[PDB]
Coordinates of C-alpha atoms and ligand atoms in Angstrom, one line a residue:
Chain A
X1 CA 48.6 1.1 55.0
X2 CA 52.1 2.6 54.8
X3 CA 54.4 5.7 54.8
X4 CA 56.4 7.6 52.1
X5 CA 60.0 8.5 53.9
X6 CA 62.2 10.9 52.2
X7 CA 65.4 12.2 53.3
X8 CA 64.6 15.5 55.2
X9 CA 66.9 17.5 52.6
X10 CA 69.2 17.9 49.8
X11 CA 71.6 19.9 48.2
X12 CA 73.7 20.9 45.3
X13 CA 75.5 23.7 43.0
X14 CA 73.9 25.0 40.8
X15 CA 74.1 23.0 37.0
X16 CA 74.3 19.8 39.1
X17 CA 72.1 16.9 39.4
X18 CA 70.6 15.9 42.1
X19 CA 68.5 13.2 43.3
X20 CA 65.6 12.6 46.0
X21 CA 64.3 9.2 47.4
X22 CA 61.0 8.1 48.4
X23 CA 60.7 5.1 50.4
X24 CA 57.4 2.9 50.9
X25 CA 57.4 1.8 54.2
X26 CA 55.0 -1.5 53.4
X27 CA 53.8 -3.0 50.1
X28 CA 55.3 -2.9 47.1
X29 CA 56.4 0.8 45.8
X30 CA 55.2 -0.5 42.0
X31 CA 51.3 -1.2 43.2
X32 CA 50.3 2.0 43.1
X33 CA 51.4 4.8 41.1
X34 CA 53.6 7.7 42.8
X35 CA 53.6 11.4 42.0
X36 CA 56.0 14.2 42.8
X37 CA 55.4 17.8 43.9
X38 CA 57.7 21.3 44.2
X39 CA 57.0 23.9 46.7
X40 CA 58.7 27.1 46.9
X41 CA 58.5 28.5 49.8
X42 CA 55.7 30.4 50.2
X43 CA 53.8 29.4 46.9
X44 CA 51.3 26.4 46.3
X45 CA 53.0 23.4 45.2
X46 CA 52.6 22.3 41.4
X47 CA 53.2 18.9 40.3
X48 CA 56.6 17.6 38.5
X49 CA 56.0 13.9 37.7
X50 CA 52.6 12.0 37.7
X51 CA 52.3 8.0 37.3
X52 CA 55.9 7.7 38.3
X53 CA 57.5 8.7 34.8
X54 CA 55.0 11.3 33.1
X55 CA 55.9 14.8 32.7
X56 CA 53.2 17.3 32.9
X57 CA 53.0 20.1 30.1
X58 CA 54.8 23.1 31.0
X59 CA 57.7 21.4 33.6
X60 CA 60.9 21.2 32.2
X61 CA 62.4 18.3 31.3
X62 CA 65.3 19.0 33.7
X63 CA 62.8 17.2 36.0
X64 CA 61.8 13.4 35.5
X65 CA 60.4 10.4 37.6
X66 CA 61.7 7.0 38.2
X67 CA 60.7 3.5 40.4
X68 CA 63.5 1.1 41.7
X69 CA 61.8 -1.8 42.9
X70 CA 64.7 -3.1 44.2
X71 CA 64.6 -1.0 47.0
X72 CA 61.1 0.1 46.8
X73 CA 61.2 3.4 46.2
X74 CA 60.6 6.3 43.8
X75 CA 63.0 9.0 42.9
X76 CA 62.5 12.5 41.5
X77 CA 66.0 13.4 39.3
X78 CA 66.6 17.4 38.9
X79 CA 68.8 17.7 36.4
X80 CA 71.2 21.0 35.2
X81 CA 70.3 22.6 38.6
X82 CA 68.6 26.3 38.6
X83 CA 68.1 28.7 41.5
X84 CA 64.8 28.8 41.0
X85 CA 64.8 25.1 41.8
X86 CA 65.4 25.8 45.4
X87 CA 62.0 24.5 46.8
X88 CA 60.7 21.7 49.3
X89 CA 59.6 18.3 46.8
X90 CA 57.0 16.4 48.4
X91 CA 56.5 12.3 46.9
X92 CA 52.9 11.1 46.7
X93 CA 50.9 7.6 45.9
X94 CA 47.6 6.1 47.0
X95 CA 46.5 3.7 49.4
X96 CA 43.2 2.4 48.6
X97 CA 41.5 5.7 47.9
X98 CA 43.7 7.5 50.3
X99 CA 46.4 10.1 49.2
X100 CA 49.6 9.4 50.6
X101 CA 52.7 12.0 51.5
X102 CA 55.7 11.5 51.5
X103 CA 57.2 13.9 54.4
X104 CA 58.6 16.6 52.0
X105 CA 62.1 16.9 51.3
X106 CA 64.2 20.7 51.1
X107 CA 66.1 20.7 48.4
X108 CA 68.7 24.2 48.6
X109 CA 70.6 25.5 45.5
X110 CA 73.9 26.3 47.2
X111 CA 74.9 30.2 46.8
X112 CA 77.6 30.1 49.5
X113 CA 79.5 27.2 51.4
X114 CA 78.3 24.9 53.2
X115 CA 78.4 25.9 56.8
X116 CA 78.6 24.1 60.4
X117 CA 76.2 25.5 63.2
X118 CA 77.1 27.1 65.9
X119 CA 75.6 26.0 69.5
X120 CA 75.2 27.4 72.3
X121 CA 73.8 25.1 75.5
X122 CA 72.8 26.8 78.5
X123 CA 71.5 24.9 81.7
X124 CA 67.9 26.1 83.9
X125 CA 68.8 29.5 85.5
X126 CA 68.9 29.7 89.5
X127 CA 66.2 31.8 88.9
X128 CA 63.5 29.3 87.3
X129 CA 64.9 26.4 89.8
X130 CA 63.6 28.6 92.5
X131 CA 60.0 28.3 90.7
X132 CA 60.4 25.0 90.5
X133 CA 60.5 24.7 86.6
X134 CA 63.9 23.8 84.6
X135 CA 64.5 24.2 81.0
X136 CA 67.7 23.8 78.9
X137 CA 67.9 26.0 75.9
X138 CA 69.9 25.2 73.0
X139 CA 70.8 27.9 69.9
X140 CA 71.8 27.1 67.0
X141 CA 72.7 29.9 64.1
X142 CA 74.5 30.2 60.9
X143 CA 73.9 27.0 59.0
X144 CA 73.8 26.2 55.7
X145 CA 71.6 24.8 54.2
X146 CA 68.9 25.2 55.8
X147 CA 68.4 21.6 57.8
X148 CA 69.7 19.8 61.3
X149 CA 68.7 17.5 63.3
X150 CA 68.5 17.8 67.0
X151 CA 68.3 14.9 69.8
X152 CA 69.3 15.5 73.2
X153 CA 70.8 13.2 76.0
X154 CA 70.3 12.5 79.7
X155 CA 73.7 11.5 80.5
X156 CA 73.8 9.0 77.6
X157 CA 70.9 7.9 77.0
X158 CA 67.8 9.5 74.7
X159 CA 65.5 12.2 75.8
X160 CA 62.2 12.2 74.1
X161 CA 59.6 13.9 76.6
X162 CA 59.7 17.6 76.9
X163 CA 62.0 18.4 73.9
X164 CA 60.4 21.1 71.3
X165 CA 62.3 22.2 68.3
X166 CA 61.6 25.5 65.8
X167 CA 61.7 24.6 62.0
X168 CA 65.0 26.7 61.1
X169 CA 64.7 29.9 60.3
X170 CA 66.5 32.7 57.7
X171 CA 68.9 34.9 58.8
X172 CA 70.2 38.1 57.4
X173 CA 73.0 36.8 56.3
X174 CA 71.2 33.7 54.4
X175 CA 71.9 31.5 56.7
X176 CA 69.8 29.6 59.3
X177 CA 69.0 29.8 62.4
X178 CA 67.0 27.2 65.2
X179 CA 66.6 26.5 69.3
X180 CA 65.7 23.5 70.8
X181 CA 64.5 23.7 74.5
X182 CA 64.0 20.8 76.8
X183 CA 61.9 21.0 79.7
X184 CA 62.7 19.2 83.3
X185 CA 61.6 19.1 86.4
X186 CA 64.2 20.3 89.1
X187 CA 64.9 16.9 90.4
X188 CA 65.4 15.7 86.7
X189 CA 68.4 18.3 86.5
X190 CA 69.9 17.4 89.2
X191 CA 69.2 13.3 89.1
X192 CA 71.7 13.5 86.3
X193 CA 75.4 14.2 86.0
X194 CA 74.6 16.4 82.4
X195 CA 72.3 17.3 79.7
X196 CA 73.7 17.2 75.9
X197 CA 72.6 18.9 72.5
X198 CA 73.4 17.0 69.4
X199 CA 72.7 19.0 66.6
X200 CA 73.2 17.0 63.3
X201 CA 74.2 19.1 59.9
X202 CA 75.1 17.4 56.7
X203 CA 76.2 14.6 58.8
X204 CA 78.5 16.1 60.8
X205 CA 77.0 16.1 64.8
X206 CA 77.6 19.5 67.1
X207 CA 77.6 18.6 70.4
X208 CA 77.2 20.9 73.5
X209 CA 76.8 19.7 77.5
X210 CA 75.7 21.4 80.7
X211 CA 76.0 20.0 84.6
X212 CA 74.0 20.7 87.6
X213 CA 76.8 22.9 88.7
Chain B
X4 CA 47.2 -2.7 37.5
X5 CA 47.9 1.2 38.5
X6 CA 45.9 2.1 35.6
X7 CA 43.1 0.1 36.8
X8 CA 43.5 1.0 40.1
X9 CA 43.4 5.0 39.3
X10 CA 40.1 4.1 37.1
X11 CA 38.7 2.8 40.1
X12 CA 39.5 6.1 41.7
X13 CA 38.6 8.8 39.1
X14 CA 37.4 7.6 36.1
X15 CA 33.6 9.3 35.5
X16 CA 31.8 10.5 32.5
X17 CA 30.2 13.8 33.3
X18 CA 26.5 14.0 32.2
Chain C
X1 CA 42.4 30.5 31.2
X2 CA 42.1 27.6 34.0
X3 CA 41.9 29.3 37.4
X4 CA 41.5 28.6 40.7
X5 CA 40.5 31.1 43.3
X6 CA 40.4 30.6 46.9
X7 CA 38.8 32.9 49.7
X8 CA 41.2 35.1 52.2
X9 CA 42.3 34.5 55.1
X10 CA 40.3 33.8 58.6
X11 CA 41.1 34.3 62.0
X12 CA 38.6 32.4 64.5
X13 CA 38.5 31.3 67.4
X14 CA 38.2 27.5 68.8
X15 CA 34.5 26.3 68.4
X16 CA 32.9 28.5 65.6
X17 CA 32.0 26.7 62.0
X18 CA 33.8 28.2 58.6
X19 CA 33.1 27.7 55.4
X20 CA 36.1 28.5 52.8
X21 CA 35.9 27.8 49.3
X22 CA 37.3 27.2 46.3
X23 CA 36.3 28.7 42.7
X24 CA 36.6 27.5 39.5
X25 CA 36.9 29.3 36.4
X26 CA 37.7 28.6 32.7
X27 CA 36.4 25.3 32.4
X28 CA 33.4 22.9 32.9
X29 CA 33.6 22.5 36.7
X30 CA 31.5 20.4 37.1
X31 CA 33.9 17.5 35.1
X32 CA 36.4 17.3 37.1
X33 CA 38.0 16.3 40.6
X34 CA 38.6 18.8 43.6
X35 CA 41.5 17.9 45.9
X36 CA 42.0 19.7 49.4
X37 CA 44.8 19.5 50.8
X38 CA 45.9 21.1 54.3
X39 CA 49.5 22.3 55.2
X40 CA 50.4 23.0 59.1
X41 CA 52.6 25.7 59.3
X42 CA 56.2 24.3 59.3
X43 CA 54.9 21.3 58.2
X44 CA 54.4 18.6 54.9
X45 CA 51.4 18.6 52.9
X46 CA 48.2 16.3 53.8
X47 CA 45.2 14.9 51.7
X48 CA 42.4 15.8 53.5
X49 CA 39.8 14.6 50.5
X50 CA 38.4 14.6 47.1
X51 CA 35.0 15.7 45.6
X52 CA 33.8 15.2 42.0
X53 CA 31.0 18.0 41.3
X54 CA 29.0 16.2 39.2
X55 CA 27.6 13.6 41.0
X56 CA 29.2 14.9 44.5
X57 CA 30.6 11.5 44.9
X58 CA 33.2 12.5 48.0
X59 CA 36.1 10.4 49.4
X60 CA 37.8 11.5 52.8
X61 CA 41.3 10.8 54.1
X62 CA 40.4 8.4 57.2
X63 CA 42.1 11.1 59.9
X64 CA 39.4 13.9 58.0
X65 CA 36.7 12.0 58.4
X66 CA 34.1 12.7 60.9
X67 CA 36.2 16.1 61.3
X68 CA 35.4 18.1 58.0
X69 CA 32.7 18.2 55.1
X70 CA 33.7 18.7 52.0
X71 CA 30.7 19.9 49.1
X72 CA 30.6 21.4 46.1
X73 CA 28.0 24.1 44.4
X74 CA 27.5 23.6 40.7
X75 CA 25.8 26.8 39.7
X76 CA 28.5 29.0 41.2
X77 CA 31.4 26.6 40.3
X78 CA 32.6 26.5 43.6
X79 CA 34.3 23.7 46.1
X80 CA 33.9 24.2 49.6
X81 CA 35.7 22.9 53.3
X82 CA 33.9 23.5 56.2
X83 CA 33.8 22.4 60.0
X84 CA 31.4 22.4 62.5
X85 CA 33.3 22.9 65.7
X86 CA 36.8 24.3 65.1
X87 CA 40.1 23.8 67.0
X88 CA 43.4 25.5 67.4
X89 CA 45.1 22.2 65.4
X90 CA 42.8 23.2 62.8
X91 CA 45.6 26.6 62.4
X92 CA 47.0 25.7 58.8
X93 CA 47.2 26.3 55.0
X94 CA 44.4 24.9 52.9
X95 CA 44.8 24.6 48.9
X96 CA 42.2 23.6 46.8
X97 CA 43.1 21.7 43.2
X98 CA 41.8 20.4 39.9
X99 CA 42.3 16.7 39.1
X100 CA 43.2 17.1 35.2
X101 CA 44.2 14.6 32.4
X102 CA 42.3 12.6 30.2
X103 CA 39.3 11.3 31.7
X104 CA 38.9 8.0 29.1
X105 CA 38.4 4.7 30.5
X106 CA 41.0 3.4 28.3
X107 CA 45.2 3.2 28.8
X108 CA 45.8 6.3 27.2
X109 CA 43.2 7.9 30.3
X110 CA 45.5 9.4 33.1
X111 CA 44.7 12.1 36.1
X112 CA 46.7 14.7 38.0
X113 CA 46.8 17.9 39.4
X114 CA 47.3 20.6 37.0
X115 CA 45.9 23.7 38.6
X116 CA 46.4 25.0 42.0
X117 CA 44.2 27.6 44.0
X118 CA 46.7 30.1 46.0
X119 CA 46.2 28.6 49.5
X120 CA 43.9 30.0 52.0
X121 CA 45.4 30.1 55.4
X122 CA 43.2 29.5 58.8
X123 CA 44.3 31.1 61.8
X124 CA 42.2 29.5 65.1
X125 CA 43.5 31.1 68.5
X128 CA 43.4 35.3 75.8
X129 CA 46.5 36.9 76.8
X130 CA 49.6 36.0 78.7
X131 CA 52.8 37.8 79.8
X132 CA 56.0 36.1 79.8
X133 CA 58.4 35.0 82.6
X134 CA 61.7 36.2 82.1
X135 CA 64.7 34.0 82.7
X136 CA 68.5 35.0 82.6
X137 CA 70.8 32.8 80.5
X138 CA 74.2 33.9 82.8
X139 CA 77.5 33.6 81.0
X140 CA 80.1 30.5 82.0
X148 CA 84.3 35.5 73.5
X149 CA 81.6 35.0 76.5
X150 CA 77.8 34.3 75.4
X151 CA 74.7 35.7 77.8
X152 CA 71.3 35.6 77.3
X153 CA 67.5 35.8 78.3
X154 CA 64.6 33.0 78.3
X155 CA 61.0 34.7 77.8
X156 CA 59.1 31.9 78.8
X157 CA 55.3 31.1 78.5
X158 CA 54.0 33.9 76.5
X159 CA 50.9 34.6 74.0
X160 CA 50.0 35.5 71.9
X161 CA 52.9 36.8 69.2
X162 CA 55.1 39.4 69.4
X163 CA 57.5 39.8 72.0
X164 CA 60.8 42.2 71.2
X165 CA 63.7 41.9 73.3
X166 CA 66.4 44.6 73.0
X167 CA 69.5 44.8 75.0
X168 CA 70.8 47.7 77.2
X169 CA 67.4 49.7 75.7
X170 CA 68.8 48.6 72.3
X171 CA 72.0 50.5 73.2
X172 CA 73.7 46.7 72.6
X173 CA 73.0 45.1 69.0
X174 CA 76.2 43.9 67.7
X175 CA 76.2 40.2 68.7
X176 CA 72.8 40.1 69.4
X177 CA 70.7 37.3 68.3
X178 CA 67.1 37.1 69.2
X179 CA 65.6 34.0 68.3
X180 CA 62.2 33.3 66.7
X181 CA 60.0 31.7 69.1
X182 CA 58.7 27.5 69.4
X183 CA 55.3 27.5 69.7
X184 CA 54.7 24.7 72.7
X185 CA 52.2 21.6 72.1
X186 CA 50.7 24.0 75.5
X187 CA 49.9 26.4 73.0
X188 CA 52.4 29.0 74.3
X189 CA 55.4 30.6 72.8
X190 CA 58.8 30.3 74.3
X191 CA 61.7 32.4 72.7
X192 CA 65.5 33.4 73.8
X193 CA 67.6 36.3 73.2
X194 CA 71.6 35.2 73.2
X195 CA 74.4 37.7 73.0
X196 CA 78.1 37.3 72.1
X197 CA 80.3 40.0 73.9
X198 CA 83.9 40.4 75.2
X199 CA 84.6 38.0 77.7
X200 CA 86.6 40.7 79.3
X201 CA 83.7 43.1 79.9
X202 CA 82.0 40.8 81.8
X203 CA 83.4 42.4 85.5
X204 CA 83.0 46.0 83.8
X205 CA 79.6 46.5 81.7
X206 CA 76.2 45.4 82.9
X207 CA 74.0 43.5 80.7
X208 CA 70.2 43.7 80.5
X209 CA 67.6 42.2 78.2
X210 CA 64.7 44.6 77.6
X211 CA 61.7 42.4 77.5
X212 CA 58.5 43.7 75.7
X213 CA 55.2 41.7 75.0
X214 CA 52.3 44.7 74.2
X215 CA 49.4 42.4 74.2
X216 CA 49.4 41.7 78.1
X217 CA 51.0 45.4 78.8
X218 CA 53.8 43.3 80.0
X219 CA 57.2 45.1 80.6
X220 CA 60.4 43.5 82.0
X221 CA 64.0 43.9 82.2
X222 CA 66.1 41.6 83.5
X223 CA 69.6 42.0 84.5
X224 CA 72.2 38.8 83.1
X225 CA 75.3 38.3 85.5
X226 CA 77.9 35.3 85.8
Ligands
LIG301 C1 39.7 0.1 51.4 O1 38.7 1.0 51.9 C2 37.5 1.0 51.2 C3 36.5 2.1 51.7 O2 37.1 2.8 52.5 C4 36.7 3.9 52.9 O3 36.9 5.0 52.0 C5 38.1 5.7 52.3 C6 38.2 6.8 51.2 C7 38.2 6.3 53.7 O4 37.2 7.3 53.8 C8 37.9 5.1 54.7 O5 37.8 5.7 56.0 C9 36.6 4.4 54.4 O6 36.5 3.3 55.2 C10 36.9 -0.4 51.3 O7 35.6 -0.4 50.6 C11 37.8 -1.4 50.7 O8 37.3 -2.7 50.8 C12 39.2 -1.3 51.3 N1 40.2 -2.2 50.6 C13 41.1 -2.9 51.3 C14 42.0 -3.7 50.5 O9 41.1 -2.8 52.5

């Protein structure tokens, strides 16, 4: 048994190449053959690559498969980038008669700049403190592309209970929007000295901190 | 070996 | 022309049985593979199992099996999914497709999916009004939490939409409770804040639920 990882997204301008990764976890990535799917959003997927190398009819030949057993993974290579490329490419193999995923990775044609999220952190109003319930909501809008990452901190340390996260969303303006909110009891809040949203995009961490205060 | 394997999977001959 | 064609959409509720299919047109169905495949919303795409018509042999991811029953009907050409007892983490996408290629037992033999059916999604969901929460101010951003609401929508507007510049309203998580959460945030001068009074109009129809809540430092 094993996964298929793949970075969670991708980008580039358009006429560009650009590549995508898929990992195997356990075993070796040339056992078993691996396949590659696109899927626009909204549409069913189609496949781009089968048997890690074969082009189906009908796919251009800006797309083509590869293995690198040297650090066992597959890649998809999309070549002389198009708009219509823009899509989220999913990695496939088998393990013994089971279909395996990869977790999907968004690939974005850029059509603007990249662009750094704003956050906003606010801490558990007085008002849900007084019903005994505490949650810390963190916004994040106009990012692009479309893809962050968000972990949130007690003090320092990792917070893994009670954190939900939206899938980013499309704003008007084409660029993205997502919240994060962590829930807390009311001793939780105040047992620390301050709660922290990270929010990760292209790398580059936005952090934002509230205090029982 | 990952043709064999996929054979193993898939391969029939339909009466 | 190869097609497939899935049925429409369903909206259930936890505990009833469906039956969605998949049909096959444009070629011998009964010679080749049918894939499902389900897709959560917001989520990657997961092999739920295989069935080849003509002898019904079926294989089952191991997390399907037990959970779902997949058959095939070869004198309507049609693939079928279908559950006994249905849950709310049964809410997803579900595509259908043809295992193509060159079915020869040879090295020039090969298999993949070359036809896709269009997705059929699978809603499976009482009512609940939200609790409203101000998000006071510490360029000055305010805000509202609705908290704990279902089912969808819930509009909030701001001074009875008198206030939309700035405004952002965002889409709502959907809690592993099964409830939605959302917040309203808006952006105004940090100089107003001791002269105009802020209030979030909160809205959700379904539980006749009506509430406006007034934001101060
Ligand atoms: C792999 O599994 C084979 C049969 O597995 C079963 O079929 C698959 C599709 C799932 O439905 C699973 O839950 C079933 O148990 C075995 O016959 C075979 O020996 C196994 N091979 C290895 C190497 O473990």
């Amino acid at each position: 048994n094993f996964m298929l990882t793949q970075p969670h997204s991708v980008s580039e301008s358009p006429g560009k190449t650009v590549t995508i990764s898929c990992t195997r976890s356990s075993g070796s990535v040339a056992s078993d053959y691996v396949q590659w799917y696109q899927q626009r959003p909204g549409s069913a997927p189609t496949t781009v690559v089968y048997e890690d190398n074969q082009r189906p009819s009908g796919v251009p030949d800006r797309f083509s498969g590869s293995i690198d057993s040297s650090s066992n993974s597959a890649s998809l290579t999309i070549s002389g980038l198009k708009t219509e490329d823009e899509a989220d490419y999913y990695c496939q193999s088998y393990d013994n008669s089971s279909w395996v995923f990869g977790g999907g990775t968004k690939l974005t044609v850029l059509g603007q700049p990249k662009a750094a999220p704003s956050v906003t952190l606010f801490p558990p109003s007085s008002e849900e403190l007084q019903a005994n319930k505490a949650t810390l909501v963190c916004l994040i809008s106009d990012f692009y592309p479309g893809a962050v990452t968000v972990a949130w901190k007690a003090d320092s340390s990792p917070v893994k209970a009670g954190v939900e996260t939206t899938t980013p969303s499309k704003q008007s303006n084409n660029k993205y929007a997502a919240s994060s909110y962590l829930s807390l009891t009311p001793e939780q809040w105040k047992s620390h000295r301050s709660y922290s949203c990270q929010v990760t995009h292209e790398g580059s961490t936005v952090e934002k901190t509230v205090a029982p205060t | 070996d990952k043709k064999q394997k996929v054979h193993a999977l898939f391969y029939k001959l339909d009466i | 022309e190869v097609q497939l064609v899935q049925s429409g959409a369903e909206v259930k509720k936890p505990g009833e049985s469906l039956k969605i299919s998949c049909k096959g047109s444009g070629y011998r169905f009964t010679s080749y593979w049918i894939v499902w495949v389900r897709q959560m919303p917001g989520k990657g795409l997961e092999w739920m199992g295989i069935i080849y018509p003509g002898d019904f042999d079926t294989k089952y991811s191991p997390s399907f099996q037990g959970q779902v029953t997949i058959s095939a009907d070869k004198s309507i050409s049609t693939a079928y999914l279908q559950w006994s007892s249905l849950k709310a983490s049964d809410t997803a996408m579900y595509y259908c497709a043809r295992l193509g290629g060159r079915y020869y037992h040879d090295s020039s033999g090969y298999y993949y999916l070359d036809y896709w059916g269009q997705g059929t999604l699978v809603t499976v969901s009482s009512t609940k009004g939200p609790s409203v929460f101000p998000l006071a101010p510490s360029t000055a951003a305010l805000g509202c939490l609705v908290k704990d609401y279902f089912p969808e929508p819930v509009t909030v507007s701001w001074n009875s939409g008198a206030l939309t510049s700035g405004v952002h309203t965002f889409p709502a998580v959907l809690q592993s409770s099964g409830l939605y959460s959302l917040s309203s945030v808006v952006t105004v001068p940090s100089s107003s804040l001791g002269t105009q009074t802020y209030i979030c109009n909160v809205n959700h129809k379904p539980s006749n639920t009506k509430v406006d809540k007034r934001v101060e430092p």
